[PDB]
């Protein structure tokens, strides 16, 4: 075997690596180092969600956002509620929702009579995603040290940002972060400080109450369209029986999976995860339901998980526990079954695209243009799961998990130079073996 | 050295161990297995906090909770504001807040003219905001009656002494629907809790333990209930200014002093005490409102001047709850030695739990038999997947052994099953026997 222990010698002190590689042609493990330890997979977890979506959902699957009602359309009139059905489209734009609201005119509706009803069916992303569910505020931090920073909320966001962030007397642009606590109805409170800065800038934020964010946005929207709504907003817990008035469809599975994999989009992963459960189980979907359904389905294919912990679709969670060799095994299922699944194309490509176009240790020959890999990142965690071709035109699957990687403070993640030297030498050896 | 690697074959497949042990008497490391891998320490991290506290706080430290006023006591009235000062006391009870306020009566006060001003400076109940204002651990009990037929709505019972509101519409699910239920708790503003989902029919009373989210509101409402029951009149505003508040000291509650606080934190692993002390340490050492990041810098720095070297450890908290903690066993070991070497001045040895006698190891299966029982002392750490010990024992030749044991990655089941400890019990029984006999 390759000598991995030699390589980890220059990863920072105290880190741990889990590395394993199999030459698919020769049917032979050619590297195997802590191959069996459970570690944090981070975004390499999406490999599993990919394969599970393929199997349980299929290529024709699409996310559906839908307008409905039981009311009789009268003259301009809608004599019932407007139920708006959200099913976790991770892709939905403000743009597209508006367009869906438009089908209400073309059908003659001037005035909606009853209430606005919002329907959900999953139990960072939710039923109602709009524009990646996030926003920004405008900070002006060109003030005196010790003096309040001016903050604005673009008018297009139904958000409050209160609290008060003073300027950092550089006597302390060390002892300083920015505390953000959320309150009922997307009211965000801010505290602490920043360092003096000349230009104006943007702080991005996740939307916490997405239900409410989406009912607010919809109401701006019926107004801009001249549809008179005067009712309440109901957020029932049950599916809402109504009559299909109109619908909006996401791009389909292969594009969704292409974006997830190449780019490492968490929301696609974690909505797909849950969509997988909703379909396998035919009922509202938790993350737990998602674990059950994704293990069960990969298990019908002969993937053995042991006591692996698969806590989400994207691998963000610090409770995920899986061993290289189980990741390794899912890859080989991918290669073997490529003819049918077409998952090989989704992996980013070294020095060419997705999350590893510029990846330091991969952008020379013979790895540039050769090594494809789903990457994974957290603070202290740098992973690669994927494939390459060696000196004989042979195929090689691998899995590199690195955890507890640490060289610096809360003030910043320090140098990646050991990572880059590690991966370089690592993949060079796999090539050459 | 001990072949720890063979003992690990007894742990569940997947798990990782870090083990290191020094025989202090000889100055010999006698086990060194991943001695240098950073791992999750869990509650053993209160070992760092305990030493930093002895050194910066000192044995005469007490937390203060205090009444102050700018007013004057005249003719039956405090003419001015009631200031109530909270500084993180994690043991404060409703009852002691009560007597503290009753000192107001005793002092002539049957009505206050000004407002109530609170002053600061820093789902379930194990984590719990160790906040400036703690009352009854910031923790309350609801009771769910789900002894009812499939279909029915679960009765929620809040005891009346809690100023909170639990609400919602949980229903009882038939045993078909039953395994698919989620019960959850959505936290709304000003201590209002919404519980949704269902559970299976239940045949005892189901309890919820909630952590209070808005501790400042919580305390203010309580203080008002207590002024009313005391027959002190008050009609003013409840103000929460964020800066320290001036006033003449009218009265002051003091907690038990540090040795008690430490004995309880070490023996029983109290998270609140650890996270409270972690911050008092910052306040006192830097003299400034204190946060977790300040706690981190101060503990690191206090220990550093004593010779402890942290390298790139991450100490995210005083209690070790956080899963961002990273520290290498060998680093834990040097604190242990430092603790055994300066025992004459620190007296931390007696705070350690005692195999089969007390604390969180009085019933620890891998330690219940001789020669470990009454010999091994050790701080435990536990989280889902983590099972650690940090302590000392006397070996067969009667010399002192200091050890550290980190186990992470421990999984024997579905993510919400009762973990099986039999592998753990085995591995510990064997490891400690090796350290004893070595
Ligand atoms: C998968 O590994 C993804 N990584 C991240 O999302 C990671 N995100 N985090 C880490 C910390 N937390 C805790 C609350 C987050 O909010 C959070 O979302 C992250 C994000 C930015 C920079 C570093 C790490 C995705 N995959 C990664 C990859 O390497 O493929 C990214 C960087 C593309 S994100
Ligand atoms: C230190 O290790 C302490 N462990 C825990 O509190 C621990 N886990 N918790 C409580 C806090 N949260 C907040 C989200 C958790 O999710 C969580 O894991 C715990 C609590 C109860 C049961 C098991 C683990 C204390 N030390 C432990 C020890 O072994 O000495 C305990 C179990 C005595 S608690």
mmCIF file of C-alpha atoms in Angstrom, chain B residues 143-424:
data_model
loop_
_atom_site.group_PDB
_atom_site.id
_atom_site.type_symbol
_atom_site.label_atom_id
_atom_site.label_comp_id
_atom_site.label_asym_id
_atom_site.label_seq_id
_atom_site.Cartn_x
_atom_site.Cartn_y
_atom_site.Cartn_z
ATOM 1 C CA UNK B 143 -46.477 18.521 32.519
ATOM 2 C CA UNK B 144 -48.006 16.986 29.558
ATOM 3 C CA UNK B 145 -51.101 14.888 30.009
ATOM 4 C CA UNK B 146 -51.243 12.621 27.094
ATOM 5 C CA UNK B 147 -53.124 9.816 28.918
ATOM 6 C CA UNK B 148 -55.915 10.147 26.502
ATOM 7 C CA UNK B 149 -57.371 8.462 23.446
ATOM 8 C CA UNK B 150 -55.758 8.690 20.049
ATOM 9 C CA UNK B 151 -57.166 11.862 18.532
ATOM 10 C CA UNK B 152 -57.379 13.993 21.670
ATOM 11 C CA UNK B 153 -55.425 17.143 22.483
ATOM 12 C CA UNK B 154 -52.718 16.954 25.067
ATOM 13 C CA UNK B 155 -53.271 18.951 28.211
ATOM 14 C CA UNK B 156 -50.283 21.134 29.103
ATOM 15 C CA UNK B 157 -49.836 22.119 32.742
ATOM 16 C CA UNK B 158 -47.675 25.033 33.749
ATOM 17 C CA UNK B 159 -47.136 25.348 37.476
ATOM 18 C CA UNK B 160 -48.277 28.850 38.467
ATOM 19 C CA UNK B 161 -45.018 30.157 40.011
ATOM 20 C CA UNK B 162 -43.457 30.291 36.528
ATOM 21 C CA UNK B 163 -44.110 33.549 34.571
ATOM 22 C CA UNK B 164 -43.967 31.812 31.167
ATOM 23 C CA UNK B 165 -46.622 30.483 28.753
ATOM 24 C CA UNK B 166 -46.464 27.134 27.207
ATOM 25 C CA UNK B 167 -49.065 26.595 24.533
ATOM 26 C CA UNK B 168 -50.014 24.671 21.393
ATOM 27 C CA UNK B 169 -51.982 21.716 20.051
ATOM 28 C CA UNK B 170 -50.214 18.395 20.495
ATOM 29 C CA UNK B 171 -52.520 15.487 19.860
ATOM 30 C CA UNK B 172 -52.369 11.820 20.774
ATOM 31 C CA UNK B 173 -51.460 9.563 17.782
ATOM 32 C CA UNK B 174 -52.735 5.939 17.275
ATOM 33 C CA UNK B 175 -49.919 3.367 17.273
ATOM 34 C CA UNK B 176 -49.935 3.311 13.477
ATOM 35 C CA UNK B 177 -49.279 7.078 13.209
ATOM 36 C CA UNK B 178 -47.403 6.793 16.477
ATOM 37 C CA UNK B 179 -43.756 6.033 15.521
ATOM 38 C CA UNK B 180 -43.823 8.939 12.993
ATOM 39 C CA UNK B 181 -44.395 11.700 15.584
ATOM 40 C CA UNK B 182 -42.150 14.584 16.333
ATOM 41 C CA UNK B 183 -42.650 16.653 19.401
ATOM 42 C CA UNK B 184 -41.232 20.124 19.144
ATOM 43 C CA UNK B 185 -40.964 23.388 20.898
ATOM 44 C CA UNK B 186 -40.789 26.705 19.076
ATOM 45 C CA UNK B 187 -39.379 29.572 21.074
ATOM 46 C CA UNK B 188 -41.261 32.876 20.733
ATOM 47 C CA UNK B 189 -40.460 36.251 22.326
ATOM 48 C CA UNK B 190 -40.674 37.109 26.026
ATOM 49 C CA UNK B 191 -40.740 33.434 27.300
ATOM 50 C CA UNK B 192 -43.568 32.017 25.282
ATOM 51 C CA UNK B 193 -43.328 28.401 24.145
ATOM 52 C CA UNK B 194 -45.261 26.733 21.370
ATOM 53 C CA UNK B 195 -45.209 22.988 21.331
ATOM 54 C CA UNK B 196 -46.315 21.091 18.187
ATOM 55 C CA UNK B 197 -46.569 17.498 17.073
ATOM 56 C CA UNK B 198 -48.031 14.437 18.692
ATOM 57 C CA UNK B 199 -46.885 11.638 20.921
ATOM 58 C CA UNK B 200 -48.104 8.081 21.567
ATOM 59 C CA UNK B 201 -50.693 7.620 24.260
ATOM 60 C CA UNK B 202 -48.777 7.871 27.569
ATOM 61 C CA UNK B 203 -49.264 5.954 30.854
ATOM 62 C CA UNK B 204 -47.344 8.126 33.287
ATOM 63 C CA UNK B 205 -47.357 11.921 33.155
ATOM 64 C CA UNK B 206 -44.897 13.186 30.578
ATOM 65 C CA UNK B 207 -42.637 15.987 31.724
ATOM 66 C CA UNK B 208 -41.074 18.784 29.754
ATOM 67 C CA UNK B 209 -38.126 20.646 31.101
ATOM 68 C CA UNK B 210 -37.692 24.003 29.429
ATOM 69 C CA UNK B 211 -34.755 26.399 29.565
ATOM 70 C CA UNK B 212 -35.882 29.982 30.047
ATOM 71 C CA UNK B 213 -34.831 31.974 26.902
ATOM 72 C CA UNK B 214 -35.258 35.481 28.121
ATOM 73 C CA UNK B 215 -33.603 35.462 31.528
ATOM 74 C CA UNK B 216 -33.855 39.243 32.065
ATOM 75 C CA UNK B 217 -37.588 39.297 31.483
ATOM 76 C CA UNK B 218 -37.877 36.165 33.591
ATOM 77 C CA UNK B 219 -36.126 37.751 36.544
ATOM 78 C CA UNK B 220 -37.990 41.092 36.238
ATOM 79 C CA UNK B 221 -41.394 39.383 36.296
ATOM 80 C CA UNK B 222 -40.341 37.305 39.241
ATOM 81 C CA UNK B 223 -39.080 40.330 41.127
ATOM 82 C CA UNK B 224 -42.463 41.964 40.595
ATOM 83 C CA UNK B 225 -44.325 38.928 41.831
ATOM 84 C CA UNK B 226 -42.074 39.029 44.861
ATOM 85 C CA UNK B 227 -42.547 42.751 45.646
ATOM 86 C CA UNK B 228 -46.285 42.175 45.443
ATOM 87 C CA UNK B 229 -46.306 39.171 47.757
ATOM 88 C CA UNK B 230 -43.999 41.209 50.050
ATOM 89 C CA UNK B 231 -46.586 44.044 50.029
ATOM 90 C CA UNK B 232 -44.078 46.482 48.642
ATOM 91 C CA UNK B 233 -45.947 48.662 46.170
ATOM 92 C CA UNK B 234 -44.527 49.276 42.739
ATOM 93 C CA UNK B 235 -46.105 50.816 39.609
ATOM 94 C CA UNK B 236 -43.096 51.794 37.514
ATOM 95 C CA UNK B 237 -41.378 50.643 34.377
ATOM 96 C CA UNK B 238 -39.113 47.619 33.987
ATOM 97 C CA UNK B 239 -35.884 48.976 32.455
ATOM 98 C CA UNK B 240 -32.865 47.054 31.124
ATOM 99 C CA UNK B 241 -30.130 49.660 30.423
ATOM 100 C CA UNK B 242 -27.035 47.503 29.521
ATOM 101 C CA UNK B 243 -24.529 49.584 31.357
ATOM 102 C CA UNK B 244 -23.494 49.134 34.949
ATOM 103 C CA UNK B 245 -25.838 51.140 37.257
ATOM 104 C CA UNK B 246 -24.757 53.430 40.183
ATOM 105 C CA UNK B 247 -26.381 53.396 43.561
ATOM 106 C CA UNK B 248 -25.836 53.094 47.222
ATOM 107 C CA UNK B 249 -25.726 49.442 48.246
ATOM 108 C CA UNK B 250 -28.900 48.609 50.129
ATOM 109 C CA UNK B 251 -28.352 44.830 50.428
ATOM 110 C CA UNK B 252 -26.336 41.966 48.995
ATOM 111 C CA UNK B 253 -26.816 38.172 48.656
ATOM 112 C CA UNK B 254 -23.571 36.168 48.534
ATOM 113 C CA UNK B 255 -23.309 32.671 47.198
ATOM 114 C CA UNK B 256 -21.331 29.899 48.683
ATOM 115 C CA UNK B 257 -17.698 30.576 48.182
ATOM 116 C CA UNK B 258 -15.528 29.066 45.539
ATOM 117 C CA UNK B 259 -14.440 25.828 47.256
ATOM 118 C CA UNK B 260 -18.074 24.811 47.558
ATOM 119 C CA UNK B 261 -18.696 25.913 43.934
ATOM 120 C CA UNK B 262 -15.810 23.927 42.697
ATOM 121 C CA UNK B 263 -16.597 20.825 44.750
ATOM 122 C CA UNK B 264 -20.059 20.720 43.233
ATOM 123 C CA UNK B 265 -18.863 21.525 39.710
ATOM 124 C CA UNK B 266 -16.211 18.745 39.736
ATOM 125 C CA UNK B 267 -18.034 16.021 41.643
ATOM 126 C CA UNK B 268 -21.391 16.406 39.930
ATOM 127 C CA UNK B 269 -20.364 18.142 36.664
ATOM 128 C CA UNK B 270 -22.496 21.227 36.875
ATOM 129 C CA UNK B 271 -22.472 22.995 33.423
ATOM 130 C CA UNK B 272 -23.864 26.273 34.770
ATOM 131 C CA UNK B 273 -21.270 26.532 37.457
ATOM 132 C CA UNK B 274 -18.529 25.944 34.931
ATOM 133 C CA UNK B 275 -19.878 28.426 32.376
ATOM 134 C CA UNK B 276 -20.588 30.973 35.095
ATOM 135 C CA UNK B 277 -17.100 30.692 36.541
ATOM 136 C CA UNK B 278 -15.558 30.727 33.053
ATOM 137 C CA UNK B 279 -17.027 34.193 32.652
ATOM 138 C CA UNK B 280 -16.465 35.518 36.197
ATOM 139 C CA UNK B 281 -12.852 34.684 35.487
ATOM 140 C CA UNK B 282 -12.958 36.994 32.442
ATOM 141 C CA UNK B 283 -14.769 39.816 34.214
ATOM 142 C CA UNK B 284 -12.286 39.811 37.036
ATOM 143 C CA UNK B 285 -9.118 39.446 34.995
ATOM 144 C CA UNK B 286 -9.984 41.943 32.272
ATOM 145 C CA UNK B 287 -12.494 44.055 34.223
ATOM 146 C CA UNK B 288 -15.054 44.259 31.419
ATOM 147 C CA UNK B 289 -18.406 42.794 30.445
ATOM 148 C CA UNK B 290 -17.425 39.253 29.729
ATOM 149 C CA UNK B 291 -18.181 36.870 26.922
ATOM 150 C CA UNK B 292 -17.125 33.347 26.000
ATOM 151 C CA UNK B 293 -14.332 34.556 23.750
ATOM 152 C CA UNK B 294 -13.032 36.674 26.691
ATOM 153 C CA UNK B 295 -13.292 33.672 28.980
ATOM 154 C CA UNK B 296 -11.282 31.742 26.480
ATOM 155 C CA UNK B 297 -8.493 34.304 26.399
ATOM 156 C CA UNK B 298 -8.317 34.716 30.102
ATOM 157 C CA UNK B 299 -8.275 31.019 31.067
ATOM 158 C CA UNK B 300 -5.596 30.375 28.445
ATOM 159 C CA UNK B 301 -3.507 33.244 29.775
ATOM 160 C CA UNK B 302 -3.929 32.418 33.462
ATOM 161 C CA UNK B 303 -2.832 28.888 32.856
ATOM 162 C CA UNK B 304 -0.053 29.912 30.546
ATOM 163 C CA UNK B 305 1.804 31.834 33.243
ATOM 164 C CA UNK B 306 1.705 28.636 35.175
ATOM 165 C CA UNK B 307 3.445 26.704 32.398
ATOM 166 C CA UNK B 308 0.565 25.037 30.600
ATOM 167 C CA UNK B 309 1.026 25.156 26.809
ATOM 168 C CA UNK B 310 -2.077 25.220 24.610
ATOM 169 C CA UNK B 311 -0.665 25.374 21.116
ATOM 170 C CA UNK B 312 -3.650 25.419 18.811
ATOM 171 C CA UNK B 313 -6.213 24.119 21.250
ATOM 172 C CA UNK B 314 -9.703 25.503 21.043
ATOM 173 C CA UNK B 315 -11.352 25.951 24.413
ATOM 174 C CA UNK B 316 -14.755 27.130 23.312
ATOM 175 C CA UNK B 317 -16.297 27.168 26.817
ATOM 176 C CA UNK B 318 -15.816 26.559 30.567
ATOM 177 C CA UNK B 319 -18.028 23.501 30.568
ATOM 178 C CA UNK B 320 -16.807 21.680 27.424
ATOM 179 C CA UNK B 321 -20.328 21.358 26.066
ATOM 180 C CA UNK B 322 -19.411 22.909 22.794
ATOM 181 C CA UNK B 323 -18.497 20.706 19.902
ATOM 182 C CA UNK B 324 -15.987 23.272 18.753
ATOM 183 C CA UNK B 325 -13.694 22.371 21.641
ATOM 184 C CA UNK B 326 -10.405 20.768 20.462
ATOM 185 C CA UNK B 327 -7.691 19.732 22.884
ATOM 186 C CA UNK B 328 -5.123 17.032 22.879
ATOM 187 C CA UNK B 329 -5.081 14.429 25.742
ATOM 188 C CA UNK B 330 -1.500 15.332 26.542
ATOM 189 C CA UNK B 331 -2.626 18.862 27.176
ATOM 190 C CA UNK B 332 -5.248 17.668 29.716
ATOM 191 C CA UNK B 333 -2.410 15.608 31.237
ATOM 192 C CA UNK B 334 -0.231 18.593 32.004
ATOM 193 C CA UNK B 335 -3.063 20.258 33.837
ATOM 194 C CA UNK B 336 -3.523 17.103 35.921
ATOM 195 C CA UNK B 337 0.166 17.024 36.876
ATOM 196 C CA UNK B 338 0.054 20.687 37.625
ATOM 197 C CA UNK B 339 -2.903 19.899 39.909
ATOM 198 C CA UNK B 340 -1.198 16.955 41.650
ATOM 199 C CA UNK B 341 2.077 19.041 42.021
ATOM 200 C CA UNK B 342 0.560 22.075 43.651
ATOM 201 C CA UNK B 343 -2.012 20.264 45.694
ATOM 202 C CA UNK B 344 -0.766 22.071 48.931
ATOM 203 C CA UNK B 345 -1.903 25.353 47.603
ATOM 204 C CA UNK B 346 -4.845 24.353 45.399
ATOM 205 C CA UNK B 347 -6.693 21.530 47.102
ATOM 206 C CA UNK B 348 -8.335 20.384 43.920
ATOM 207 C CA UNK B 349 -7.732 16.722 44.529
ATOM 208 C CA UNK B 350 -10.655 16.320 46.866
ATOM 209 C CA UNK B 351 -13.058 17.682 44.297
ATOM 210 C CA UNK B 352 -12.489 14.771 41.927
ATOM 211 C CA UNK B 353 -15.287 12.138 41.739
ATOM 212 C CA UNK B 354 -14.321 8.836 43.475
ATOM 213 C CA UNK B 355 -14.695 5.474 41.890
ATOM 214 C CA UNK B 356 -17.676 3.748 43.523
ATOM 215 C CA UNK B 357 -17.973 6.227 46.358
ATOM 216 C CA UNK B 358 -19.375 9.552 44.969
ATOM 217 C CA UNK B 359 -19.835 11.999 42.026
ATOM 218 C CA UNK B 360 -20.539 10.913 38.499
ATOM 219 C CA UNK B 361 -18.499 7.749 38.837
ATOM 220 C CA UNK B 362 -19.963 6.291 42.041
ATOM 221 C CA UNK B 363 -21.641 3.707 39.823
ATOM 222 C CA UNK B 364 -19.292 3.638 36.810
ATOM 223 C CA UNK B 365 -19.387 0.023 35.768
ATOM 224 C CA UNK B 366 -15.843 -0.211 34.478
ATOM 225 C CA UNK B 367 -14.542 1.108 37.776
ATOM 226 C CA UNK B 368 -16.756 -0.641 40.307
ATOM 227 C CA UNK B 369 -14.384 -3.474 41.274
ATOM 228 C CA UNK B 370 -11.057 -3.647 43.047
ATOM 229 C CA UNK B 371 -8.387 -2.518 42.638
ATOM 230 C CA UNK B 372 -10.108 0.558 41.044
ATOM 231 C CA UNK B 373 -12.949 1.160 43.479
ATOM 232 C CA UNK B 374 -11.845 3.674 46.164
ATOM 233 C CA UNK B 375 -8.651 4.258 44.170
ATOM 234 C CA UNK B 376 -9.352 6.014 40.873
ATOM 235 C CA UNK B 377 -10.631 9.555 41.003
ATOM 236 C CA UNK B 378 -11.687 11.169 37.682
ATOM 237 C CA UNK B 379 -13.757 13.871 36.009
ATOM 238 C CA UNK B 380 -16.101 12.502 33.455
ATOM 239 C CA UNK B 381 -17.100 14.071 30.191
ATOM 240 C CA UNK B 382 -20.113 12.862 28.199
ATOM 241 C CA UNK B 383 -21.922 13.820 24.972
ATOM 242 C CA UNK B 384 -23.627 11.601 22.408
ATOM 243 C CA UNK B 385 -20.641 9.699 21.011
ATOM 244 C CA UNK B 386 -18.159 10.912 23.653
ATOM 245 C CA UNK B 387 -17.019 9.169 26.864
ATOM 246 C CA UNK B 388 -14.013 10.526 28.683
ATOM 247 C CA UNK B 389 -12.176 10.437 32.045
ATOM 248 C CA UNK B 390 -9.428 12.656 33.406
ATOM 249 C CA UNK B 391 -7.856 11.806 36.791
ATOM 250 C CA UNK B 392 -5.517 9.885 39.035
ATOM 251 C CA UNK B 393 -5.124 6.512 40.672
ATOM 252 C CA UNK B 394 -2.591 4.587 42.798
ATOM 253 C CA UNK B 395 -0.956 1.721 41.097
ATOM 254 C CA UNK B 396 0.008 -1.712 42.517
ATOM 255 C CA UNK B 397 3.318 -0.374 43.874
ATOM 256 C CA UNK B 398 1.480 2.518 45.558
ATOM 257 C CA UNK B 399 2.714 5.242 43.158
ATOM 258 C CA UNK B 400 0.567 8.015 41.676
ATOM 259 C CA UNK B 401 -0.702 7.681 38.181
ATOM 260 C CA UNK B 402 -2.276 10.615 36.270
ATOM 261 C CA UNK B 403 -4.180 9.767 33.219
ATOM 262 C CA UNK B 404 -6.431 11.082 30.407
ATOM 263 C CA UNK B 405 -8.881 9.126 28.331
ATOM 264 C CA UNK B 406 -10.829 10.617 25.337
ATOM 265 C CA UNK B 407 -13.158 8.504 23.398
ATOM 266 C CA UNK B 408 -15.047 10.041 20.396
ATOM 267 C CA UNK B 409 -16.893 8.407 17.566
ATOM 268 C CA UNK B 410 -18.735 5.976 19.783
ATOM 269 C CA UNK B 411 -21.822 4.631 18.097
ATOM 270 C CA UNK B 412 -23.756 1.430 18.631
ATOM 271 C CA UNK B 413 -27.161 2.345 17.283
ATOM 272 C CA UNK B 414 -29.851 4.368 15.508
ATOM 273 C CA UNK B 415 -29.204 8.093 16.347
ATOM 274 C CA UNK B 416 -32.035 8.157 18.962
ATOM 275 C CA UNK B 417 -31.455 4.726 20.671
ATOM 276 C CA UNK B 418 -30.018 4.043 24.138
ATOM 277 C CA UNK B 419 -26.263 3.677 23.539
ATOM 278 C CA UNK B 420 -24.839 0.322 24.760
ATOM 279 C CA UNK B 421 -22.128 0.910 27.412
ATOM 280 C CA UNK B 422 -20.935 -2.718 27.578
ATOM 281 C CA UNK B 423 -18.050 -2.098 25.234
ATOM 282 C CA UNK B 424 -17.194 0.984 27.282
#
